[PDB]
């Protein structure tokens, strides 16, 4: 509302909000470090962007006896990006302070308490655990220690390489690298399975086809197996919850990315007027983002209205008293694409 | 700011000693897009006569809309706020105040016409002035250096305390500039929150989401720091917590509409009280409200749901009111409230 | 076109007003040789710079500290001078090099932010003035400053990094370190003349630069996809020194001001529209005047579109002008005595 | 009435400055002859090479441009000395601008002089047809030149006269002929507002 | 009634009351602290908003031997919000002074006297007790001690975890966390049962199917049991009163929130005129609030008239003598939903 007070020419520019959703990085991990490690002591966190950079922060050569070094080189040899190092006792504090963190990686030590108090609905985090170090017990009861959290996954067994001498690489270190490579190439909705391990790593124990079937139900253990014609592959993409909503890692991780992207987009429209013009802009911005996902194949459906729906209005989602109390309510439905875990061929 | 310098002595020392943030606060106000303003200088001791004249002096200047006390002392601010009569704020004047504490809210004569902000802001460097600028120093130096040394020690004593505790500036001065910047860019109906502060160093105290939620219920608007955005204003609520006067844009939009219409009706105060007069009065207000609705200031798909005006012999008045000289006009507006909370409901359908 | 101004301390004291320079001979005629800002002025001219201004806060010998430099930049008289001198478009402060980077503490980080704010304040004296900024030497502090900068004038700020070394030498045989702001400013003038304002000053070769003062790999974290990114001066294998980046300090990803060309192109359009509108200040407000204004504006915009300055296949998507008793104002506006013109544009994307 | 500020000075002036009204009166005739009475006598140069005694800033004019405004004579860097502002001493919408007030003055003066040749004519239908045609042609000419705003002539003016339109039977018997004339004067575009997207 | 005294323009606002009901938090607990605890000594109460904040208020590390520390960390690990710490002897005094409190938690010590005098109809409070620490006696008579209060519930048995050494976590501490999570996700009308215990806690004693059946009547004991496929779950949502009105926790807790929300809303109409215009506004505000509950599924009914009714008028609820004595009477009916505790499948 320019106030004209002197004769002349006045210049105005449109200041109405322009809203659109931007895709963020969905593979930023956090590694757990023991207390006695000198690199992490005396600092809140360490950001490492390269394997050589980690050596630069260090002052010694590569050590195959320390779990931190082998885990980092296994993570980087499989691809990925910058990662944070946080003390285990400081995970509950530092992790919420970092808004770019997506994955929580055990890195070979107990982080059970941190996961239960951090990985919660709406937080956008995901956790990767480490399987048991011993033989896979035949009757299938080597899962009791784990908690059925739909935001976590467990991988088995621990990996070994030529450079390893007496301590085996935790599987979560290499799996985190696989997550970034799959997301960058195929997308977050793609299952991080049926893909090779780039580091030339070998599983410590062999897993038979029937043994995997024993542990593939309920709080399942995703298995890294060697195949005669394909080498070493990641087999299984199940979380620790067996219900239809969050059975598979891609479905849970796809919702994490979608919620994070929309949440960041809506922060630019918080105190905007709660009327019809605002509703039209937010509806268009969200519809375009979901339409892009359906084009790329992230949502299943013949037509866009069969894959997603967005509702916002004066009589659709909120009432008159909701507006008077300053609440804007948006309902978003999404049909995530699921992996084809089993392929069934039947002939006549 | 250049106009202020040509008329006032910018500095951190009050005329003779006292410490004043008024000059620094005004610099921040112009830095944040503030427009032309009015200055009410206080001279000598804070007498009771000055307090009584404050509502009178403000009313003489016909364009004044917002009231700000850019002082830092809590006791001085409390005296100024209480001096504002309830008849002053209720006439269409909005007060911007600074909270002295995170836990308790301010006590105000008119809660509906007051916005409170917390915490104060920090700046790196204050405004230092040469001795020729401080009123009573250059003349005093050449006349009697002995007393000049006496005054300088107190001046130096003031200088290092400010540097030690940090340069704390009351935030109400900054927020006044945000009000004008928002009103220039968007309408008065747009909430003045979610706006990035400019030319600032740090906030006095960092706040968390849990802490702000405690104050937001009490009506204390917060200044938050967000990594993706910087320092922003997070809050648009007044000191009254009913459905009508809860958000600042709703209250200030009515103040503008009432003042604009009241000023236009001054040319009708003796026109004949008959049908032709009512038609002209109704059309003028209807066009004004229709323009506001098209700008997005009123909620509704059709004008019948956004505003209504009623004036007539049997709909608003009666025979006795006309015989007694009363002309009654009914105006209804459905202002647009800000979306203080965005709720996303994700389903797997 | 962009006419840069140089602000710094000069060995020969002069008045508080700026000077007009069209060649190094005029620079020598007014100023003596040898000095950091004289070397950059030579660098600007030698890259293809045509004309520029020079403003002096004081003599070269009275350099005190970072806070003194910022305080000197905050004086009122500089703002008035650039406001008065109409044709100044860019602001350059190469004297920031002369100060060492002792530590990465909060004291150093805040000082860099104030220099950015102080320059941006000088850029708000007139509309359309762009500021060219520098960054701290190490990537760690620069990344910290980029994320923590909070200002509403991020749209008008462009920052370049790192520092550059050139073939120029002092009496001692040491390579002179120069800021890349002088080099790009010549490129903009060349780009403005040869290619126009709407052409991004990126992916273009500089001249007489030995090597960037720092490397490539350390600069990966400074660029950012969404916002608060930097613009890189980067050496290439078999391609010479190149300017890599054309992004401003704007944070929001959806803003059209994220690129320097789009912000400058719109301001360039704004200047002509203000110039054209001055001829209509007291014209009668009827249909004849609206048609005259619409015709002149449409013809000039059509001329700009045919040079590739606007994104569009037909005229309608390229631009649109509205002016009339309807679709631009109401009858009450005519009685108020104001004319409202609405112009829609479609900018390009680099 | 209108007020102009400040007083003007020239090279030939020694100690007494020229009152602005003397030069402004000359500007009125030049603008009227070239563009017309409805044209605003502003945004035009002073032909005498005269200079204002004091400079007026942009904001200072903005302070005095409301209510009983003072029209300002200012010097511009690229246009020299110009007359800035065309407001009268009344701020209502009817007579805010000089051209609107002066246009009605000329229209009333012209029609009044023309009507003196039809004073004692018979007050019947044939006379009404002649007066209606004469006034309609005059107002049509003004609309053609752009002095009145409107897409069509009936949106710019109207003339009413008749036995049951403007006067009654008793008015005719008392020797009164009444003509109602409406005019939509064109107003200066004092402010130009440009908004981009 | 503006008084016209001078010629001019007069400005005033409509001051008729605007009434609306807002939802208040339904899971704010109060914990009981022993007298000897130094943190609570010398202060009326302490408000703690986070687990890290509690350690900040303390000065030592986590102590697995103090009942206060284990109860708080079990409460927060299951989800929740701010909680108040009050001495047991001061429960009768401080609790009525806090109007945001909803739950009373035993936290492993006797609060029977406080509950009997605080949890009364209309007060809006609720209590969570602790079951016996010993073996569940088979004949079913291990319940004589508890008082059949319809505002209280008992949970058995006490829980244990890896971090616990010699003192077991009282069940009420963890259950109070479950209440907040269920209320936030599904609503106060949903039974806080058949939901997991998020802290990785284990019951101290196993409860068979038959044993629970013995204690599920009358003054029932809600049981925490471990299932082979679902882990540890909360089984049972019965109060200490077995009549049809208040048999289930959700029915009692839903009403507690309903009266509290409406009571707060009616505080803005205490001295309003007692005539028709006020009755219309009060009825409309209450009807909108109840309609919102029925939409969310909190009330059972095919049509709104089958779920609730509101009556207020000159001849509907109050008489002429009632009005003359300053009494406004509103009758509110509510058809609360009930849990499907037993599911019976019949095949033919």
PDB file of C-alpha atoms in Angstrom, chain B residues 172-347:
ATOM      1  CA  UNK B 172      10.440  -2.365  20.430  1.00  0.00           C
ATOM      2  CA  UNK B 173      12.306   0.209  18.337  1.00  0.00           C
ATOM      3  CA  UNK B 174      13.338  -2.493  15.857  1.00  0.00           C
ATOM      4  CA  UNK B 175       9.808  -3.898  15.684  1.00  0.00           C
ATOM      5  CA  UNK B 176       8.336  -0.500  14.800  1.00  0.00           C
ATOM      6  CA  UNK B 177      10.419  -0.506  11.626  1.00  0.00           C
ATOM      7  CA  UNK B 178       9.151  -3.997  10.830  1.00  0.00           C
ATOM      8  CA  UNK B 179       5.574  -2.718  11.134  1.00  0.00           C
ATOM      9  CA  UNK B 180       6.147  -0.029   8.502  1.00  0.00           C
ATOM     10  CA  UNK B 181       8.130  -2.343   6.220  1.00  0.00           C
ATOM     11  CA  UNK B 182       5.352  -4.941   6.333  1.00  0.00           C
ATOM     12  CA  UNK B 183       2.654  -2.318   5.734  1.00  0.00           C
ATOM     13  CA  UNK B 184       4.556  -0.992   2.717  1.00  0.00           C
ATOM     14  CA  UNK B 185       5.134  -4.424   1.162  1.00  0.00           C
ATOM     15  CA  UNK B 186       1.894  -6.190   2.121  1.00  0.00           C
ATOM     16  CA  UNK B 187      -1.231  -4.814   3.726  1.00  0.00           C
ATOM     17  CA  UNK B 188      -1.929  -3.967   7.341  1.00  0.00           C
ATOM     18  CA  UNK B 189      -3.770  -7.300   7.458  1.00  0.00           C
ATOM     19  CA  UNK B 190      -0.505  -9.210   7.005  1.00  0.00           C
ATOM     20  CA  UNK B 191       0.969 -10.259  10.336  1.00  0.00           C
ATOM     21  CA  UNK B 192       4.300  -8.533  11.104  1.00  0.00           C
ATOM     22  CA  UNK B 193       5.897 -11.853  12.101  1.00  0.00           C
ATOM     23  CA  UNK B 194       8.153 -14.121  10.019  1.00  0.00           C
ATOM     24  CA  UNK B 195      10.268 -11.107   9.024  1.00  0.00           C
ATOM     25  CA  UNK B 196      14.065 -11.184   9.120  1.00  0.00           C
ATOM     26  CA  UNK B 197      15.684  -8.587  11.361  1.00  0.00           C
ATOM     27  CA  UNK B 198      18.448  -6.512   9.787  1.00  0.00           C
ATOM     28  CA  UNK B 199      21.643  -4.964  11.107  1.00  0.00           C
ATOM     29  CA  UNK B 200      21.776  -6.999  14.316  1.00  0.00           C
ATOM     30  CA  UNK B 201      24.554  -8.917  16.065  1.00  0.00           C
ATOM     31  CA  UNK B 202      22.794 -11.381  18.383  1.00  0.00           C
ATOM     32  CA  UNK B 203      19.727 -11.817  20.558  1.00  0.00           C
ATOM     33  CA  UNK B 204      20.136 -11.359  24.301  1.00  0.00           C
ATOM     34  CA  UNK B 205      19.005 -14.912  25.097  1.00  0.00           C
ATOM     35  CA  UNK B 206      18.488 -17.905  22.825  1.00  0.00           C
ATOM     36  CA  UNK B 207      15.095 -19.612  22.986  1.00  0.00           C
ATOM     37  CA  UNK B 208      13.902 -23.141  22.261  1.00  0.00           C
ATOM     38  CA  UNK B 209      10.614 -24.375  20.834  1.00  0.00           C
ATOM     39  CA  UNK B 210       9.445 -25.622  24.238  1.00  0.00           C
ATOM     40  CA  UNK B 211      10.201 -22.312  25.960  1.00  0.00           C
ATOM     41  CA  UNK B 212       8.433 -20.200  23.328  1.00  0.00           C
ATOM     42  CA  UNK B 213       5.283 -22.307  23.569  1.00  0.00           C
ATOM     43  CA  UNK B 214       5.075 -21.374  27.243  1.00  0.00           C
ATOM     44  CA  UNK B 215       5.240 -17.649  26.469  1.00  0.00           C
ATOM     45  CA  UNK B 216       3.041 -17.749  23.359  1.00  0.00           C
ATOM     46  CA  UNK B 217       0.103 -18.815  25.527  1.00  0.00           C
ATOM     47  CA  UNK B 218       0.762 -15.828  27.809  1.00  0.00           C
ATOM     48  CA  UNK B 219       0.937 -13.451  24.843  1.00  0.00           C
ATOM     49  CA  UNK B 220       4.686 -12.710  24.693  1.00  0.00           C
ATOM     50  CA  UNK B 221       5.991 -12.520  21.134  1.00  0.00           C
ATOM     51  CA  UNK B 222       9.406 -14.110  20.677  1.00  0.00           C
ATOM     52  CA  UNK B 223      12.482 -13.314  18.603  1.00  0.00           C
ATOM     53  CA  UNK B 224      13.863 -16.632  17.365  1.00  0.00           C
ATOM     54  CA  UNK B 225      16.978 -17.619  15.436  1.00  0.00           C
ATOM     55  CA  UNK B 226      16.659 -20.199  12.659  1.00  0.00           C
ATOM     56  CA  UNK B 227      19.705 -21.520  10.819  1.00  0.00           C
ATOM     57  CA  UNK B 228      18.004 -21.619   7.417  1.00  0.00           C
ATOM     58  CA  UNK B 229      16.627 -18.081   7.804  1.00  0.00           C
ATOM     59  CA  UNK B 230      18.487 -16.115  10.492  1.00  0.00           C
ATOM     60  CA  UNK B 231      16.901 -13.877  13.126  1.00  0.00           C
ATOM     61  CA  UNK B 232      13.138 -13.634  12.603  1.00  0.00           C
ATOM     62  CA  UNK B 233      10.088 -12.437  14.510  1.00  0.00           C
ATOM     63  CA  UNK B 234       8.076 -15.434  15.734  1.00  0.00           C
ATOM     64  CA  UNK B 235       4.766 -14.187  17.118  1.00  0.00           C
ATOM     65  CA  UNK B 236       1.855 -11.917  16.199  1.00  0.00           C
ATOM     66  CA  UNK B 237      -0.368 -11.922  19.304  1.00  0.00           C
ATOM     67  CA  UNK B 238      -1.528  -9.040  21.491  1.00  0.00           C
ATOM     68  CA  UNK B 239      -2.001  -9.143  25.273  1.00  0.00           C
ATOM     69  CA  UNK B 240      -5.688 -10.137  25.012  1.00  0.00           C
ATOM     70  CA  UNK B 241      -6.580 -13.796  24.499  1.00  0.00           C
ATOM     71  CA  UNK B 242     -10.176 -13.803  23.275  1.00  0.00           C
ATOM     72  CA  UNK B 243     -11.421 -14.761  19.826  1.00  0.00           C
ATOM     73  CA  UNK B 244     -11.788 -11.176  18.596  1.00  0.00           C
ATOM     74  CA  UNK B 245      -8.610  -9.327  19.626  1.00  0.00           C
ATOM     75  CA  UNK B 246      -5.953 -12.032  19.708  1.00  0.00           C
ATOM     76  CA  UNK B 247      -3.744 -11.323  16.668  1.00  0.00           C
ATOM     77  CA  UNK B 248      -2.026  -8.013  15.941  1.00  0.00           C
ATOM     78  CA  UNK B 249      -3.105  -7.745  12.257  1.00  0.00           C
ATOM     79  CA  UNK B 250      -6.784  -8.137  13.171  1.00  0.00           C
ATOM     80  CA  UNK B 251      -6.616  -5.375  15.779  1.00  0.00           C
ATOM     81  CA  UNK B 252      -4.552  -2.938  13.706  1.00  0.00           C
ATOM     82  CA  UNK B 253      -6.647  -3.466  10.571  1.00  0.00           C
ATOM     83  CA  UNK B 254      -9.735  -2.337  12.480  1.00  0.00           C
ATOM     84  CA  UNK B 255      -7.841   0.700  13.782  1.00  0.00           C
ATOM     85  CA  UNK B 256      -7.028   1.739  10.213  1.00  0.00           C
ATOM     86  CA  UNK B 257     -10.564   1.163   8.926  1.00  0.00           C
ATOM     87  CA  UNK B 258     -12.180   3.020  11.827  1.00  0.00           C
ATOM     88  CA  UNK B 259      -9.817   5.995  11.571  1.00  0.00           C
ATOM     89  CA  UNK B 260     -10.193   6.254   7.789  1.00  0.00           C
ATOM     90  CA  UNK B 261     -13.997   6.107   7.898  1.00  0.00           C
ATOM     91  CA  UNK B 262     -14.216   8.458  10.888  1.00  0.00           C
ATOM     92  CA  UNK B 263     -12.095  11.031   9.052  1.00  0.00           C
ATOM     93  CA  UNK B 264     -14.302  10.816   5.956  1.00  0.00           C
ATOM     94  CA  UNK B 265     -17.552  11.243   7.906  1.00  0.00           C
ATOM     95  CA  UNK B 266     -16.417  14.627   9.261  1.00  0.00           C
ATOM     96  CA  UNK B 267     -17.857  16.253   6.115  1.00  0.00           C
ATOM     97  CA  UNK B 268     -21.301  14.728   6.795  1.00  0.00           C
ATOM     98  CA  UNK B 269     -21.722  15.915  10.389  1.00  0.00           C
ATOM     99  CA  UNK B 270     -24.516  18.357   9.493  1.00  0.00           C
ATOM    100  CA  UNK B 271     -25.922  17.035   6.214  1.00  0.00           C
ATOM    101  CA  UNK B 272     -29.690  16.437   6.009  1.00  0.00           C
ATOM    102  CA  UNK B 273     -30.801  13.181   7.639  1.00  0.00           C
ATOM    103  CA  UNK B 274     -32.876  11.754   4.800  1.00  0.00           C
ATOM    104  CA  UNK B 275     -32.759   8.997   2.187  1.00  0.00           C
ATOM    105  CA  UNK B 276     -30.405  10.725  -0.323  1.00  0.00           C
ATOM    106  CA  UNK B 277     -27.771  11.228   2.382  1.00  0.00           C
ATOM    107  CA  UNK B 278     -27.907   7.574   3.445  1.00  0.00           C
ATOM    108  CA  UNK B 279     -27.405   6.359  -0.131  1.00  0.00           C
ATOM    109  CA  UNK B 280     -24.234   8.425  -0.546  1.00  0.00           C
ATOM    110  CA  UNK B 281     -22.894   7.375   2.864  1.00  0.00           C
ATOM    111  CA  UNK B 282     -23.593   3.697   2.196  1.00  0.00           C
ATOM    112  CA  UNK B 283     -21.973   3.783  -1.251  1.00  0.00           C
ATOM    113  CA  UNK B 284     -18.788   5.457   0.001  1.00  0.00           C
ATOM    114  CA  UNK B 285     -18.232   2.882   2.746  1.00  0.00           C
ATOM    115  CA  UNK B 286     -19.267   0.023   0.451  1.00  0.00           C
ATOM    116  CA  UNK B 287     -16.672   1.012  -2.154  1.00  0.00           C
ATOM    117  CA  UNK B 288     -13.985   1.326   0.529  1.00  0.00           C
ATOM    118  CA  UNK B 289     -14.744  -2.119   1.953  1.00  0.00           C
ATOM    119  CA  UNK B 290     -15.013  -3.620  -1.538  1.00  0.00           C
ATOM    120  CA  UNK B 291     -11.509  -2.362  -2.333  1.00  0.00           C
ATOM    121  CA  UNK B 292     -10.218  -3.908   0.897  1.00  0.00           C
ATOM    122  CA  UNK B 293     -11.816  -7.269   0.084  1.00  0.00           C
ATOM    123  CA  UNK B 294     -10.218  -7.429  -3.370  1.00  0.00           C
ATOM    124  CA  UNK B 295      -6.804  -6.747  -1.816  1.00  0.00           C
ATOM    125  CA  UNK B 296      -7.242  -9.859   0.337  1.00  0.00           C
ATOM    126  CA  UNK B 297      -7.916  -8.087   3.642  1.00  0.00           C
ATOM    127  CA  UNK B 298     -11.297  -9.770   4.221  1.00  0.00           C
ATOM    128  CA  UNK B 299     -12.263 -13.446   4.190  1.00  0.00           C
ATOM    129  CA  UNK B 300     -15.092 -14.618   1.957  1.00  0.00           C
ATOM    130  CA  UNK B 301     -15.949 -15.854  -1.528  1.00  0.00           C
ATOM    131  CA  UNK B 302     -18.570 -13.132  -2.087  1.00  0.00           C
ATOM    132  CA  UNK B 303     -18.935  -9.613  -0.653  1.00  0.00           C
ATOM    133  CA  UNK B 304     -22.009 -10.630   1.363  1.00  0.00           C
ATOM    134  CA  UNK B 305     -19.776 -12.888   3.485  1.00  0.00           C
ATOM    135  CA  UNK B 306     -16.882 -10.415   3.866  1.00  0.00           C
ATOM    136  CA  UNK B 307     -18.584  -7.133   4.799  1.00  0.00           C
ATOM    137  CA  UNK B 308     -21.964  -5.489   5.276  1.00  0.00           C
ATOM    138  CA  UNK B 309     -23.184  -1.918   5.790  1.00  0.00           C
ATOM    139  CA  UNK B 310     -26.605  -1.010   7.188  1.00  0.00           C
ATOM    140  CA  UNK B 311     -28.116   2.472   7.429  1.00  0.00           C
ATOM    141  CA  UNK B 312     -31.789   3.333   7.095  1.00  0.00           C
ATOM    142  CA  UNK B 313     -34.909   4.686   8.729  1.00  0.00           C
ATOM    143  CA  UNK B 314     -36.218   1.361  10.056  1.00  0.00           C
ATOM    144  CA  UNK B 315     -33.176  -0.937   9.829  1.00  0.00           C
ATOM    145  CA  UNK B 316     -30.778   1.098  11.956  1.00  0.00           C
ATOM    146  CA  UNK B 317     -32.543   4.184  13.357  1.00  0.00           C
ATOM    147  CA  UNK B 318     -36.058   5.164  14.425  1.00  0.00           C
ATOM    148  CA  UNK B 319     -38.209   8.289  14.435  1.00  0.00           C
ATOM    149  CA  UNK B 320     -36.962   9.378  17.864  1.00  0.00           C
ATOM    150  CA  UNK B 321     -33.283   9.132  16.899  1.00  0.00           C
ATOM    151  CA  UNK B 322     -33.880  11.245  13.789  1.00  0.00           C
ATOM    152  CA  UNK B 323     -35.811  13.784  15.868  1.00  0.00           C
ATOM    153  CA  UNK B 324     -32.882  13.895  18.310  1.00  0.00           C
ATOM    154  CA  UNK B 325     -30.275  14.237  15.554  1.00  0.00           C
ATOM    155  CA  UNK B 326     -28.665  10.786  15.664  1.00  0.00           C
ATOM    156  CA  UNK B 327     -27.454   9.055  12.504  1.00  0.00           C
ATOM    157  CA  UNK B 328     -26.491   5.420  13.086  1.00  0.00           C
ATOM    158  CA  UNK B 329     -24.412   3.329  10.669  1.00  0.00           C
ATOM    159  CA  UNK B 330     -23.660  -0.374  11.138  1.00  0.00           C
ATOM    160  CA  UNK B 331     -20.421  -1.710   9.643  1.00  0.00           C
ATOM    161  CA  UNK B 332     -19.334  -5.338   9.727  1.00  0.00           C
ATOM    162  CA  UNK B 333     -15.931  -6.672   8.678  1.00  0.00           C
ATOM    163  CA  UNK B 334     -14.590 -10.234   8.604  1.00  0.00           C
ATOM    164  CA  UNK B 335     -10.849  -9.742   8.999  1.00  0.00           C
ATOM    165  CA  UNK B 336      -8.337 -12.409   7.979  1.00  0.00           C
ATOM    166  CA  UNK B 337      -6.361 -14.100  10.758  1.00  0.00           C
ATOM    167  CA  UNK B 338      -2.781 -15.373  10.406  1.00  0.00           C
ATOM    168  CA  UNK B 339      -2.032 -19.091  10.210  1.00  0.00           C
ATOM    169  CA  UNK B 340      -0.067 -19.298  13.454  1.00  0.00           C
ATOM    170  CA  UNK B 341       0.040 -23.109  13.220  1.00  0.00           C
ATOM    171  CA  UNK B 342       0.432 -25.265  10.109  1.00  0.00           C
ATOM    172  CA  UNK B 343      -0.631 -28.877  10.669  1.00  0.00           C
ATOM    173  CA  UNK B 344       0.269 -31.532   8.095  1.00  0.00           C
ATOM    174  CA  UNK B 345      -1.714 -34.775   8.315  1.00  0.00           C
ATOM    175  CA  UNK B 346      -0.024 -37.536   6.318  1.00  0.00           C
ATOM    176  CA  UNK B 347      -2.023 -40.650   5.472  1.00  0.00           C
TER     177      UNK B 347
END
